[PDB]
Short mmCIF file of all heavy atoms in Angstrom, two decimals:
data_model
loop_
_atom_site.label_atom_id
_atom_site.label_comp_id
_atom_site.label_asym_id
_atom_site.label_seq_id
_atom_site.Cartn_x
_atom_site.Cartn_y
_atom_site.Cartn_z
N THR A 321 77.03 22.44 49.76
CA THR A 321 76.17 21.85 50.81
C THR A 321 75.03 22.88 51.07
O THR A 321 73.92 22.46 51.47
CB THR A 321 77.00 21.47 52.02
OG1 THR A 321 76.10 20.92 53.03
CG2 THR A 321 77.62 22.66 52.61
N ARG A 322 75.38 24.14 51.11
CA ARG A 322 74.28 25.18 51.23
C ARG A 322 73.21 24.99 50.15
O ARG A 322 71.96 24.97 50.55
CB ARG A 322 74.91 26.57 51.16
CG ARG A 322 75.19 27.16 52.51
CD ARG A 322 75.63 28.61 52.25
NE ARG A 322 74.72 29.39 51.61
CZ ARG A 322 74.87 30.48 50.95
NH1 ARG A 322 76.13 31.08 50.99
NH2 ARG A 322 74.02 31.16 50.27
N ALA A 323 73.56 24.80 48.93
CA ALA A 323 72.53 24.62 47.83
C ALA A 323 71.82 23.34 48.14
O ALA A 323 70.57 23.29 47.92
CB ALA A 323 73.36 24.58 46.53
N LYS A 324 72.42 22.24 48.42
CA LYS A 324 71.81 20.95 48.62
C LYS A 324 70.79 21.10 49.82
O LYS A 324 69.65 20.67 49.62
CB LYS A 324 72.80 19.85 48.99
CG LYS A 324 73.65 19.35 47.77
CD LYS A 324 74.82 18.49 48.17
CE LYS A 324 74.50 17.60 49.38
NZ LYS A 324 75.71 17.04 49.95
N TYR A 325 71.19 21.67 50.87
CA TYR A 325 70.28 21.83 52.01
C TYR A 325 69.16 22.79 51.75
O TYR A 325 68.05 22.51 52.28
CB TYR A 325 71.09 22.14 53.35
CG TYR A 325 71.69 20.94 54.00
CD1 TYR A 325 72.96 20.49 53.56
CD2 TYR A 325 71.06 20.27 54.94
CE1 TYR A 325 73.48 19.37 54.13
CE2 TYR A 325 71.67 19.20 55.58
CZ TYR A 325 72.88 18.76 55.17
OH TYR A 325 73.48 17.66 55.78
N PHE A 326 69.42 23.82 50.98
CA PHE A 326 68.35 24.69 50.61
C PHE A 326 67.21 23.90 49.83
O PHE A 326 66.00 24.04 50.04
CB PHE A 326 68.87 25.85 49.86
CG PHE A 326 67.83 26.65 49.03
CD1 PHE A 326 66.83 27.47 49.69
CD2 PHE A 326 67.81 26.50 47.70
CE1 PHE A 326 65.93 28.10 49.01
CE2 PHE A 326 66.92 27.23 46.93
CZ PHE A 326 65.90 28.03 47.53
N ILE A 327 67.70 23.14 48.81
CA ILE A 327 66.80 22.45 47.96
C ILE A 327 66.01 21.44 48.77
O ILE A 327 64.79 21.15 48.48
CB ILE A 327 67.55 21.85 46.74
CG1 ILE A 327 68.17 22.89 45.84
CG2 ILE A 327 66.62 20.90 45.97
CD1 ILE A 327 69.23 22.36 44.93
N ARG A 328 66.71 20.74 49.75
CA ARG A 328 65.98 19.80 50.56
C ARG A 328 65.00 20.45 51.48
O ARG A 328 63.86 19.87 51.65
CB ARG A 328 67.11 19.09 51.40
CG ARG A 328 66.66 17.65 51.80
CD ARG A 328 66.01 17.67 53.15
NE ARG A 328 66.90 18.37 54.15
CZ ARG A 328 67.85 17.80 54.89
NH1 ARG A 328 68.11 16.51 54.73
NH2 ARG A 328 68.53 18.54 55.70
N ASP A 329 65.30 21.59 52.10
CA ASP A 329 64.34 22.22 52.95
C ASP A 329 63.15 22.81 52.17
O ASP A 329 62.01 22.95 52.76
CB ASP A 329 65.05 23.36 53.79
CG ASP A 329 66.02 22.85 54.74
OD1 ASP A 329 65.83 21.72 55.20
OD2 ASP A 329 66.99 23.50 55.11
N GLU A 330 63.36 23.08 50.92
CA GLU A 330 62.23 23.48 50.06
C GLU A 330 61.15 22.49 50.07
O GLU A 330 59.87 22.74 50.11
CB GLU A 330 62.61 23.85 48.64
CG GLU A 330 63.03 25.34 48.45
CD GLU A 330 61.90 26.31 48.98
OE1 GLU A 330 60.71 25.98 48.86
OE2 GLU A 330 62.21 27.35 49.52
N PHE A 331 61.50 21.15 50.03
CA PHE A 331 60.54 20.13 50.11
C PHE A 331 60.07 19.82 51.52
O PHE A 331 58.93 19.58 51.73
CB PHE A 331 61.14 18.73 49.45
CG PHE A 331 61.17 18.78 47.96
CD1 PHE A 331 62.31 19.30 47.28
CD2 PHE A 331 60.13 18.32 47.16
CE1 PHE A 331 62.32 19.33 45.95
CE2 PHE A 331 60.15 18.40 45.80
CZ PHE A 331 61.24 18.84 45.22
N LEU A 332 60.99 19.92 52.42
CA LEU A 332 60.72 19.54 53.79
C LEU A 332 59.65 20.54 54.40
O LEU A 332 58.85 20.17 55.20
CB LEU A 332 61.98 19.61 54.65
CG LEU A 332 62.56 18.26 54.99
CD1 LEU A 332 63.63 18.43 56.01
CD2 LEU A 332 61.57 17.23 55.36
N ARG A 333 59.67 21.83 54.00
CA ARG A 333 58.73 22.80 54.45
C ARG A 333 57.30 22.36 54.01
O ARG A 333 56.36 22.38 54.86
CB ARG A 333 59.06 24.18 53.90
CG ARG A 333 57.94 25.09 53.79
CD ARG A 333 58.39 26.48 53.45
NE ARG A 333 59.44 27.03 54.41
CZ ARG A 333 60.77 27.10 54.12
NH1 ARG A 333 61.08 27.00 52.85
NH2 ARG A 333 61.54 27.54 55.04
N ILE A 334 57.07 22.05 52.76
CA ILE A 334 55.78 21.52 52.25
C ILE A 334 55.40 20.27 53.07
O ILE A 334 54.26 20.19 53.31
CB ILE A 334 55.84 21.32 50.76
CG1 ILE A 334 56.26 22.62 50.08
CG2 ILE A 334 54.50 20.85 50.22
CD1 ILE A 334 56.40 22.44 48.52
N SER A 335 56.32 19.43 53.22
CA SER A 335 56.08 18.11 53.90
C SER A 335 55.58 18.42 55.36
O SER A 335 54.51 17.81 55.84
CB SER A 335 57.24 17.25 53.94
OG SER A 335 57.04 16.11 54.77
N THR A 336 56.18 19.27 56.05
CA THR A 336 55.93 19.59 57.50
C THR A 336 54.60 20.35 57.63
O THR A 336 53.93 20.17 58.59
CB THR A 336 57.05 20.29 58.12
OG1 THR A 336 58.11 19.31 58.19
CG2 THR A 336 56.73 20.71 59.54
N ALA A 337 54.38 21.38 56.74
CA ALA A 337 53.31 22.42 56.91
C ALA A 337 51.88 21.65 57.18
O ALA A 337 51.14 22.01 58.13
CB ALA A 337 53.25 23.31 55.83
#
Side-chain angles (χ1 to χ4, degrees):
Chain A
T321 184
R322 265 186 50 199
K324 283 169 38 190
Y325 276 86
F326 161 74
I327 296 162
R328 205 267 309 273
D329 291 331
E330 268 307 327
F331 284 92
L332 262 190
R333 153 170 311 111
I334 303 177
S335 170
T336 293

